Amino acid sequence: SQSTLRASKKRLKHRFWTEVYQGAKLFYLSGVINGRYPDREILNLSRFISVMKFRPLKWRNEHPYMLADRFTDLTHPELIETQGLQIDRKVAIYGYLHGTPLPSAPGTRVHIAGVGDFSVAQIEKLPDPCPTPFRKRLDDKDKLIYA
Amino acid sequence: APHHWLLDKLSGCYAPRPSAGPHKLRESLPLIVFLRNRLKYALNGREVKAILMQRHVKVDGKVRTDTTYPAGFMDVITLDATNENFRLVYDVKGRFAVHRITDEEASYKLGKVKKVQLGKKGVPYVVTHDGRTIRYPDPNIKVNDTVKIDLASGKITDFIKFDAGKLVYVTGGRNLGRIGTIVHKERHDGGFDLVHIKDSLDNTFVTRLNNVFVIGEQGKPYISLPKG
Amino acid sequence: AVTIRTRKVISNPLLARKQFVVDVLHPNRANVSKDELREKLAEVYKAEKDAVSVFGFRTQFGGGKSVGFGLVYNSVAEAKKFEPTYRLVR
RNA sequence: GCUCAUUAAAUCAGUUAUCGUUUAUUUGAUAGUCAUGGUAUAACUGUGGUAAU
RNA sequence: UUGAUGAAUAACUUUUCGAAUCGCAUGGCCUUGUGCUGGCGAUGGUUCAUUCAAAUUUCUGCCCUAUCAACUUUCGAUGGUAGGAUAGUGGCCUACCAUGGUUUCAACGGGUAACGGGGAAUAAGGGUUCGAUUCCGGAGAGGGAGCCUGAGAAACGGCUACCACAUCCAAGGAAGGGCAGGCUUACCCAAUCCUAAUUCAGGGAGGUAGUGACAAUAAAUAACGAUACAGGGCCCAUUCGGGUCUUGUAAUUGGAAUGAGUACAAUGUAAAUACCUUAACGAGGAACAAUUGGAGGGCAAGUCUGGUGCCAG
16 A cells, blocks of 8 residues: 555654755665675666765864774784784774875874774875766766776 | 538537538538548547448448548438438528438439530530439430439439429528428629529528529429428 | 436447436435445346446435446447446446 | 747738648549569678777 | 430551469369369559559648838749640749739748747646647758669768777778767556567567655554652732632553554456565564753862952852
């Protein structure tokens, strides 16, 4: 029945708008039917996340933060074989900075969420692996992932 | 949609357009309106198609298989079912009227000549209003006269010259489609001849000489007019 | 059981069929389930069910009755020739 | 089929006139003046070029 | 007077057609070969007419204006004739020839927000004159210009340049024309009509359903009864006070009804969704558990502030 379905739809909009609503827009996915969704719903999803126009927030413009893309340990295995898995490991981490400029003099202290208070030891930027291009569509060569 | 079809405004948006044919398109009544709509023989538009392909209907001595086939004034429409013969005749109020006739009356029709000349190799010919051109007519047959047609062949069995004081049907104009048997013939600028008409109540009415169709003598009409 | 009344029994020999408006009376039941009428409209005549065709049943409001249109052909092989395909499948 | 730039005897409305014209389709008429000629497209068979059609 | 009759020659052509077309009937004569002959159609095809058109055309009928009286011959204006061009008329075009045209009866010129107007067309069975539909008029498909097919186009879902964009390249070349949105790319050809060789096939014509509650409407959240226990409940009054009465219960309790949901079929439809109809369930408070808004008091081994004890705030 659509009428019990449509009544359940407005019960979920008028629930969700009590908490979030800035113009908030939730929409309806069809089904997982083949490990995948119909392409119109994926387009309307990818449309709605492309017109989002984010505001900046108060905590994010005071604290330099980043998300770790890939995790790398840089220790000699001879340090590991001698000291016998007791060592605290020299670790290189990779990510995109955010928010405010993280100062490049090594020695600022900086906190992994869920590990503890650490400090930086050596800084190095790189060319980013996913560049923005440099009223046309994107060429499919230029849409590009990094995983 | 025109006036004389007696269609409702209901039952579907688009009006069934007429095909090109013998009659004029504004004078025509298509067979789709004739079967499913006024005579109520069929229901859907597709049901008209099944009647035509099985050749139930014959119009004026021909098979005549077409959905939007233009039927006009004075057309013998013979249906092989029921042994009934139909002749279209216009009604005074502005509309067409389907009419019952006999087998002998389904044999003949009347036809107004529109133009007469001399054909090739010295042959006279007259051209009826239904576009039936006929070789070797009577030289008495001249413009605006009616022609009785055999319909077994294309031959002419009777002819009535246009003379004042004979029972006239009107095909066109404002006062289109009455009896009234003649007052006289007027001349005017540009032609525009107004053949005057005085009805059963003896009232003057005025249409064009183009609209004049002689349906009989003072007294007798040659065809069975519908009485009501 | 059910009871049927026929109004405007009109014969159309072009399609070689008996048309009529069907006036179906529902004393208590719910409805009449058109296959049951194609049974009952057959045996009121000689029809051998599939030479009848009932389609236009819109109910009297509140129940109790339904009005529609019935097409009874002759020569049952003609039902394949003149009926539409969406009534052959019913 | 969509979109941009405003016309006062022009448009439009009816009316003729087409013996002033052209018309595929529609319909109606209508011709007395070698058991088989001669060609012809390809597909195909295989070789290649060209960043590419 | 009555009737009745009349009013092809000679040549030419980048020689067109005169059927190397099809279906039913299978018959007739003699030198008997599968010979000779022979019926009804159908389709072409020439020309004519017809209609669907299209092209010009006749005539009558538009809003304001003299603070526009002359206008035109100042791209022919009026006409004659001849040629050309065209499907054809034609000053359409050009030669040559005449000086005319419209006008106080308003020519011509100007204003028109000409979203205003057309009975173009039904419409509203009392909303007082409401509706919808159709018609505007012109131009364009990046801009100019020239062309080709076709009954129809001076066609941008064609070619040739030019001007300007703009994409692919291995640098030799190749190729291409904005539209919706901001401050559903679903189902269907049934109905409808259209298209076609045409019952069939097809139409993002057309209909169906989705995101789109703004606003506005008719319900429901409970009916009904017994028993028990208490004696007090309400009204008016500025104070004293007065008035009147079967009223009250965080009390037990009995059945009987029902749709808000839940849930088979049938109907509907092209198929559905939905409505309609209809079984099977489905009410006792922690339920199948509506809110917003106002008025008013009370409580602590509480806190704070003031005070001529225990109070006032």
